[PDB]
Design a protein around this ligand. Structure first.
Ligand code: HEM
Ligand SMILES: OC[C@H]1O[C@H](O[C@H]2[C@H](O)[C@@H](O)[C@H](OCCCCCC3CCCCC3)O[C@@H]2CO)[C@H](O)[C@@H](O)[C@@H]1O
Ligand SMILES: CC1=CC[C@H]2[C@@H](C1)C2(C)C
Length: 461
């Protein structure tokens, strides 16, 4: 009959005065205590329905896909993306851009696996050259994941010591942080007001323009050398489609979709997997007995030299459990990416009007103590049975579900496994901080959950 229950709002401020100072997620976990798994919070001027736990989330994204499949905005980046590109598009643009992006990622020329394998070898050579010196591995982790996207999109990889590559990686890093910051969460509530003032939203806008400028230039160099009978990469393929549909003024294959879809694939392609890697190696420093056990399995299944391959996974249940647990623990996007309802819909008795924003709080499925005993601790046994065999679970939804499910899922799982195991096959880790002193508390927790900076050494075996 009405919207899910929640804290009683004030006219201008919504539920501001009921929020927790520590962020949106914390705010929402407190409301969930009081209201249950389906509730409404007024984020500044508008109601947003929160869905918590695997059942409710899957009931919405899978059983009710006809309605929960729209994409909402992220205040901090809407001014840039404006509903262009696969992540932020709706309706028929999304359908075109999704089919195109899914279809030209898989089809191309090396397999996905081969490209990751080569990149893993370049990574190992790089880590060798560093001769056990301390670094903050953020740049390398962004470099190897960026290079996978790059070879699909630009037809090329960049070298780790290229200062122009590094400068773009810095912008991806700064932006993800700024977006996930306390100001970014405030902005989600009050963009309407805050936009008129200086603040992080302008820096994010400017960073994204700067990345936009490289992509515009690359599109140009491609157009100039384009061979219709032999498209090199995803940009070439988009250009061909642009040609084919030029007589339709309403073609989705526009120039803004070109730039912003590409940029969307890049952002998501780089920052998601690299952040998981960052948390992953920090977790390894804090739990060296886990890293040592992963290494014993690599030794026994793969050996000290033969490059790891995807077909190794099924024979490495421990390593897979550690990687699942890294993802579960990391909780990359704790509230997922905003959805909206596309038509009036009933959900557990409530009525959700059309164009009502919905957050699926993926963090609540990942921390569900019915599936994961002691869900706030890192523990790979979360994903092992009695016999040490891999135990997958329905609650494991860090890619979300349904029509909008991460389209990069397969690529990211390939990268996490090949980069994790290839590094561990060749190196052990050390740092100047004892495992008991290692603090896992995120540096940011908003849209994204971002681990603190740290120094690590990679020691050759
Ligand atoms: C650890 C790595 C990753 C995680 C945890 C992750 C997670 C997610 C999540 C939660 C969503 C939101 C789905 C929803 O709207 O309900 C998403 C969407 C998306 N992701 Fe991933 N992602 C990862 C890696 C990647 C990679 C490597 C790519 C590209 C190569 C990618 C590309 C995308 C795109 C294009 C969307 C939007 C899909 C759509 O709206 O139709 N992601 N991702
Ligand atoms: O397009 C106009 C702009 O061009 C110049 O910037 C160059 C720089 O001179 C040049 O150093 C830079 O090189 C960047 C190469 C690395 C790009 C790698 C990433 C790009 C996309 C996401 C993944 C990979 O590209 C920029 C864009 O062409 C000028 O310096 C700018 O001031 C100007 O506004
Ligand atoms: C896959 C992710 C989608 C939404 C968040 C991160 C990448 C971006 C695009 C800011």
């Amino acid at each position: 009959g009405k919207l899910p229950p929640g804290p009683r709002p004030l006219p201008l401020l919504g539920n501001l005065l009921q929020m927790d100072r520590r962020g949106l997620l914390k705010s929402f976990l407190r409301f969930r205590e009081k209201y249950g798994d389906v509730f409404t919070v007024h984020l500044g001027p508008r109601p947003v329905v929160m869905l918590c736990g695997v059942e409710a989330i899957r009931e919405a994204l899978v059983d009710k896909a006809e309605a929960f499949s729209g994409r909402g905005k992220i205040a901090m980046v809407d001014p840039f993306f404006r509903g262009y590109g696969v992540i932020f598009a709706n309706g028929n643009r999304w359908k075109v851009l999704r089919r195109f992006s899914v279809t030209t990622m898989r089809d191309f020329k090396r397999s996905v696996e081969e490209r990751i394998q080569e990149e893993a070898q370049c990574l190992i050579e790089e880590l060798r050259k560093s001769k056990g010196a301390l670094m903050d591995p953020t740049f390398l982790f962004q470099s190897i994941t960026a290079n996978i996207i790059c070879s699909i999109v630009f037809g090329k990889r960049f070298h780790y010591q290229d200062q122009e590559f590094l400068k773009m990686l810095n912008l991806f890093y700064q932006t993800f942080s700024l977006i996930s910051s306390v100001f970014g969460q405030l902005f989600e509530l009050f963009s309407g007001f805050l936009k008129h003032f200086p603040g992080a939203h302008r820096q994010v806008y400017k960073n994204l323009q700067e990345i936009n400028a490289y992509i515009g230039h690359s599109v140009e160099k491609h157009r100039e050398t384009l061979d219709p009978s032999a498209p090199r990469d995803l940009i070439d393929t988009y250009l061909l489609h642009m040609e084919k549909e030029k007589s339709n003024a309403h073609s989705e294959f526009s120039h803004q979709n070109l730039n912003l879809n590409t940029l969307s694939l890049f952002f998501a392609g780089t920052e998601t997997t690299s952040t998981t890697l960052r948390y992953g190696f920090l977790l390894m420093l804090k739990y060296p007995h886990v890293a040592e056990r992963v290494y014993r399995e690599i030794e026994q299944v793969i050996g000290p030299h033969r490059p790891p391959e995807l077909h190794d996974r099924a024979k490495m249940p421990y390593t897979e459990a550690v990687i699942y647990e890294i993802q579960r623990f990391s909780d990359l996007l704790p509230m997922g990416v905003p959805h909206i309802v596309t038509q009036h819909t009933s959900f557990r008795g409530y009525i959700i009007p059309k164009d009502t924003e919905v957050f699926l709080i993926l963090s609540t499925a990942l921390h569900d103590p019915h599936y994961f005993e002691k869900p706030d601790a890192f523990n790979p046994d979360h994903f092992l049975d009695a016999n040490g065999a891999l135990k997958k679970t329905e609650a494991f939804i860090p890619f979300s579900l349904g029509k909008r499910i991460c389209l990069g899922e397969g690529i990211a799982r390939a990268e996490l496994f090949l980069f994790f195991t290839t590094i561990l096959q060749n190196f052990s880790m050390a740092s100047p901080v004892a495992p008991e002193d290692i603090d896992l508390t995120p540096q940011e927790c908003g849209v994204g959950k971002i681990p603190p900076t740290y120094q690590i050494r990679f020691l050759p075996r």
